[PDB]
C-alpha cells in the first residue's frame, strides 16, 4: 500500500495532464496502472525530467509532435496509417491519448501507457538495453512468443516494451509472460533488483 502510494507520489511529478476538457477518471486509472511499475524506474524517470503527457486529442496536434504528421511509424508500414493515427508514443518522451489504454484501441499493446513508458525506461534509464547483445539473444529465442510477429518479433525494442508491459500490468499478464517467455521474465526480474 505504502509502496503504491510512493509510486503515485513519484508519478505526480512525472505525469502532465492536458489543458482543457478530458476524462479525469480515466486519466487517474492510467496513473494507477503506471504506479505498478517498480519505483526505481519511476524515480529515475523523475530524475531525468521525463514527462508522461496525457492527451485528449491526436498526438500530432501537439506542437512538439507536429513534425510527425504524415510520417509512417516503424512497424506500421503498409497500413495506410501514419503517426496521426497512433495513440501512444514512447522513447525520449512519452505521449498518450486518454481512453486508448486497452489493446485494440488503435494499437496492439496489452496496455498503451505501460508499453510507451517502457520505451522511455529502455532509452533514458537503461541506455537502450533492448538493443544490447544480451537482450538480442533473448529476443532471438522468445521475441515471437507474444504474437504480433511482424512487429514484436522484428524489433527488439518493441518486444522489450511489450514484455515490460506484461510484467507490470497485472498478475495475469505477469504469469502469462513467465510461461511464454521465461528468459525474458528472468531478465526483467533481475533488472529490477
Amino acid at each position: 500500500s505504502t509502496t503504491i502510494q510512493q509510486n503515485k507520489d513519484t508519478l505526480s511529478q512525472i505525469v502532465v495532464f492536458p489543458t482543457g476538457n478530458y476524462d479525469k477518471n480515466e486519466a487517474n486509472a492510467m496513473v494507477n496502472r503506471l504506479a505498478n511499475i517498480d519505483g526505481k524506474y519511476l524515480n529515475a524517470l523523475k530524475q531525468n525530467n521525463l514527462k508522461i503527457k496525457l492527451l485528449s486529442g491526436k498526438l500530432t496536434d501537439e506542437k512538439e509532435y507536429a513534425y510527425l504528421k504524415g510520417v509512417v511509424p516503424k512497424g506500421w508500414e503498409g497500413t495506410g496509417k501514419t503517426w496521426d493515427d497512433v495513440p501512444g508514443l514512447g522513447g525520449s518522451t512519452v505521449a498518450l491519448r486518454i481512453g486508448f489504454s486497452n489493446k485494440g484501441k488503435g494499437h496492439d499493446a496489452i496496455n498503451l501507457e505501460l508499453h510507451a513508458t517502457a520505451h522511455a525506461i529502455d532509452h533514458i534509464v537503461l541506455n537502450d538495453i533492448s538493443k544490447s547483445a544480451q537482450f538480442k539473444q533473448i529476443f532471438a529465442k522468445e521475441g515471437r512468443s507474444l504474437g504480433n510477429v511482424n512487429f514484436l518479433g522484428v524489433y527488439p525494442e518493441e518486444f522489450f516494451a511489450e514484455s515490460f508491459a506484461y510484467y507490470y500490468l497485472n498478475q495475469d499478464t505477469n504469469s502469462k509472460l513467465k510461461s511464454a517467455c521465461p528468459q525474458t521474465y528472468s531478465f526483467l526480474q533481475n533488472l529490477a533488483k
Binding site: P73, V86, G91
Partner: peptide
C-alpha cells in the same frame, strides 16, 4: 527517439 520515438516508438509506437
Amino acid at each position: 527517439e520515438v516508438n509506437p
